[PDB]
Amino acid sequence: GLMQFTLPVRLCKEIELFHFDIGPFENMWPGIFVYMVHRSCGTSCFELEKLCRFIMSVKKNYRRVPYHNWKHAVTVAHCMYAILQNNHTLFTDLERKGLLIACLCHDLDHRGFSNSYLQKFDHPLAALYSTSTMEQHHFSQTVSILQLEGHNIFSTLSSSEYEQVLEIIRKAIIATDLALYFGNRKQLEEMYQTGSLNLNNQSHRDRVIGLMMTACDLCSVTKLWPVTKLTANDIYAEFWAEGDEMKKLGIQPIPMMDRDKKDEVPQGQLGFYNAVAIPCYTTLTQILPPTEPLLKACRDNLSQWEKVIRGEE
Ligand SMILES: CC(C)Cn1ncc(Cl)c1C(=O)Nc1ccn2cc(-c3ccccc3)nc2n1
Numbered sequence: 206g207l208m209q210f211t212l213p214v215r216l217c218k219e220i221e222l223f224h225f226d227i228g229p230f231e232n233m234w235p236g237i238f239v240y241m242v243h244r245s246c247g248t249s250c251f252e253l254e255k256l257c258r259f260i261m262s263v264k265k266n267y268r269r270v271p272y273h274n275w276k277h278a279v280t281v282a283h284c285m286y287a288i289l290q291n292n293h294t295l296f297t298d299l300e301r302k303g304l305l306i307a308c309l310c311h312d313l314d315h316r317g318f319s320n321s322y323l324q325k326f327d328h329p330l331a332a333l334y335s336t337s338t339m340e341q342h343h344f345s346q347t348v349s350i351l352q353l354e355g356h357n358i359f360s361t362l363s364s365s366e367y368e369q370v371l372e373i374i375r376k377a378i379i380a381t382d383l384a385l386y387f388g389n390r391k392q393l394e395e396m397y398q399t400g401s402l403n404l405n406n407q408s409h410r411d412r413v414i415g416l417m418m419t420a421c422d423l424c425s426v427t428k429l430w431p432v433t434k435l436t437a438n439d440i441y442a443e444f445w446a447e448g449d450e451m452k453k454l455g456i457q458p459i460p461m462m463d464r465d466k467k468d469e470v471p472q473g474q475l476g477f478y479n480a481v482a483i484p485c486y487t488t489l490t491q492i493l494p495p496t497e498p499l500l501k502a503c504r505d506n507l508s509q510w511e512k513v514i515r516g517e518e
C-alpha cells in the first residue's frame with residue numbers, strides 16, 4: 206500500500222517526456238511499467254503481487270525477435286503513459302487501467318511476420334482469424350494470461366466494469382492492425398473538420414483510442430534521431446527475414462521486405478512518414494492538443510530521412 210516505485214533522477218524526469226527511451230537494462234523495464242501504472246492510475250488500481258506476476262507472464266510470452274519483442278511492448282506502453290499524463294481529465298479511471306495493459310499486451314507472442322505472410326504460408330492462425338490475424342491472437346493471449354491462477358489484476362472490478370475493461374483492451378489491440386488505421390483516421394478527420402466529433406459518443410471515443418494505439422505503436426518515429434535510426438535496423442531485420450520466407454514460398458516479396466533493395470529504404474521511410482506517421486500524429490494533435498510533441502518529433506525525423514537521401518548522411 207505504501208510501497209511506491211522510484212527511479213533514478215534522470216529517468217524520473219525523462220520518463221514524463223514523449224521521446225523517452227527505456228534503455229538497454231531489461232531488468233528495469235518492469236519497474237518502469239509499474240511506476241507508470243502507479244502515477245497514471247493510482248497505487249490502488251492493481252494488487253502489486255498480482256500485477257508483478259501478470260507483467261512477468263506477459264514478458265515470458267513475448268519472443269526473442271528483433272523488433273516485436275518485450276522492449277517494444279514497454280516502449281508502446283510508455284508512449285500511452287505520456288499521452289494519458291498530458292490529457293489528465295479526458296480519460297475515465299477504467300480507460301487509464303485498460304490502455305496501459307492493452308499496450309503491454311498488444312503484440313503478445315509475435316513471431317516477426319505480417320498478417321500477409323501468415324495467409325500466404327496458410328498458418329493455422331489465418332484459418333482461425335480471417336482479418337487482423339495476429340491482433341486477434343494477441344488479444345486471445347492477453348485473455349489466457351489474465352485467466353492464469355493469481356494473474357487477474359482486474360479481480361476487484363464489478364462483473365460489468367470487468368466486461369467494459371476487456372472490451373476497451375480488445376478494441377485497443379485490434380486497432381493496432383495498421384490495415385484498419387487508414388479508414389479509422391479518415392473518419393476521425395471528417396468528424397473533427399465538419400465539427401461532429403463528440404467524446405461522450407462511445408463509438409467516437411473508440412475511434413480516438415484506436416488512433417492513440419496507432420500513435421503509441423508507431424512511436425519509434427517520434428524518438429530522437431539516433432533512437433529512430435537504430436530502431437529502423439530492428440524493424441528491417443524482421444522485414445527482410447519475412448522477405449526471405451516469402452522467396453522460400455516462391456513469391457517475390459514487396460521491396461520493403463527485399464534485402465536486395467536496401468538502397469531504397471530512405472525513400473520507403475519518406476513514403477511511410479508522409480502516408481502514415483505524419484497524418485496519424487496530425488489528427489491525434491487536432492483531437493488531443495497536448496500530444497503535439499509527437500508530431501514535432503515525427504516531423505524532425507522526416508527531415509532527418511530527407512537528409513539521408515541528399516547524401517548529407
Ligand atoms: C513495424 C511496422 C509493422 C510498422 N512500423 N512501425 C514503425 C515503422 Cl517506421 C513501421 C513501418 O511500417 N515502416 C515502414 C513502412 C513502410 N515502408 C516501406 C518501406 C520501403 C523500404 C525499401 C524499399 C521500398 C519501401 N519501408 C517501410 N518501412
Ligand SMILES: [Mg+2]
Nearest residue numbers: 311312339381
Ligand atoms: Mg502488432
Ligand SMILES: [Zn+2]
Nearest residue numbers: 311312381422
Ligand atoms: Zn506493436
